[PDB]
């Protein structure tokens with residue numbers, strides 16, 4: 274057995290949060306360490322780089338020498354489950370220019386400022402509908418299953434043209450896919466979603482329908498400009514991203530704001546602060562903090578350190594968002610600060626497609642909770658909650674809440 278000191282210069286990565294709104298101890302360690310880059314050891318024993326500073330993160334996310342090719346052998350997979358991404362055709366998140374651009378542009382029209390603005394009445398209706406259903410069901414509710422998840426689910430389903438009648442199926446499959454612990458479990462959830470989306474495509478070919486999937490079938494698919502499997506992958510990416518991210522932000526935002534009563538009170542008293550508070554919560558909670566995996570296709574020198582071709586690089590936006598040279602006292606929640614320039618949504622060509630939809634949803638959600646249920650509180654201590662591991666989208670699967 275090992276009879277010598279166990280200190281390493283390439284710590285295990287990722288790490289799990291112990292506090293919903295604070296970096297794992299190991300991540301705080303990396304944040305405090307000088308230099309833009311640090312060595313880590315991934316689950317499979319391979320070494321990769323992490324990017325741990327704000328400006329360096331922007332630079333590297335903008336660098337065309339860092340590929341998003343998830344089918345590349347050297348891609349820094351963070352868990353066994355990740356191996357189900359490199360099994361089907363890639364959605365544009367796993368593509369590089371010029372392929373990335375041709376696919377992304379097929380979807381952008383649904384996420385424009387004009388369209389997002391137009392969605393506000395719809396989002397407000399959905400939020401208040403699930404809210405008054407939960408409240409009528411009586412206190413001691415799970416905010417996740419009863420509010421946090423169904424809200425963005427219904428909204429993204431309308432955008433895509435996915436029938437909400439099938440929600441129990443695809444919500445379950447989404448959770449199984451994103452939170453899968455092994456490759457086999459992930460592949461099964463993917464195959465389940467794929468078969469369903471495949472059926473929807475055939476339905477659309479017979480009888481055209483509304484939504485992005487409807488449009489892609491009638492247009493790009495009919496022209497052979499997108500492969501059928503690519504359409505499935507694209508729809509799956511938007512469906513899952515649309516579900517899981519906003520849900521995670523809602524639940525973690527509630528926990529975080531309840532732990533900062535003075536700021537939450539301030540928020541209630543002046544709703545002009547909500548858009549700014551949403552940005553701060555995005556910066557602070559960074560729920561997709563390892564959604565910045567890359568592979569170097571050429572040598573890259575970064576402030577005296579060399580990233581070699583073939584090496585994996587993960588841009589860790591939670592750590593980058595806690596860069597004290599950009600955000601004064603970075604580990605303090607401050608809804609009054611400028612959280613502008615944060616990396617919660619990434620940067621560059623792969624910068625979050627849904628970011629303005631997420632902003633709208635969270636603004637509507639927070640205003641709704643403050644309007645309708647100002648006495649919302651956790652029904653269990655924060656210590657009794659179970660946080661998801663650092664290998665997946667950050668959040669809680671259950672959030673016991675009560676009110677008066």
Ligand code: HEM
Pocket residue numbers: 341365366367377510511512514515516518519522555559560561564565566590616617618619620622623624625626627628630631
């Ligand atoms: C709720 C807060 C959200 C956060 C924190 C978040 C985070 C991120 C991050 C960090 C990326 C960059 C990934 C990379 O560079 O590899 C990304 C990309 C993406 N996100 Fe978001 N996301 C959120 C909400 C959403 C929503 C609601 C949608 C709706 C469809 C969405 C759809 C997408 C898509 C399609 C991409 C890939 C963009 C591309 O590769 O060109 N996201 N997201």
Ligand SMILES: C=C1/C(=C\C=C2/CCC[C@]3(C)[C@@H]([C@H](C)CCCC(C)(C)O)CC[C@@H]23)C[C@@H](O)C[C@@H]1O
Pocket residue numbers: 351352354355356357358361362363364366450451452453459463506507509510513563564565566664665666
């Ligand atoms: C939806 C898609 C697919 C898989 C998504 C998965 C499967 C494996 C585990 C993943 C990649 C989860 C990750 C463990 C979450 C951590 C963030 C990350 C490692 C991606 O930074 C989130 C989504 C999950 C199938 C693909 O065909 C389309 C789309 O691409």
